[PDB]
Amino acid sequence: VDQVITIGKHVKGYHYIIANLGFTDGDLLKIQFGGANVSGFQIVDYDDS
């Protein structure tokens, strides 16, 4: 992710699928505003009480 950003490939037109079970375990904020699609998976639902 750090290198995609430095290369400028986090813009609209690219789409990344993070294939692990912890989509929000890492820092997504930094790739959030480029325009790229970023999808993943999450097993820990922080909405559960």
Ligand X SMILES: *[C@@H]1O[C@H](CO)[C@@H](O[C@@H]2O[C@H](CO)[C@@H](O)[C@H](O)[C@H]2NC(C)=O)[C@H](O)[C@H]1NC(C)=O
Residue 40 engages a copy of itself in binding (rule: CB under 8 A):
no
Q: Rounded to whole angstroms, how far apart are CA atoms 45 and 3?
A: 29
Q: According to CB under 8 A, which residues from 10 to 39 bind a copy of itself?
A: 10-11, 33-35
**Residue 15, interface with ligand X (CB under 6 A)?**
yes
CB of 38 to a copy of itself, least distance (A): 14
Nearer to a copy of itself, 7 or 19 (CB): 7
Q: 26-48 as b/e, with b when 16 or more CB fall inside 10 Å?
A: eeeeebeeeebebebeeeeeeee
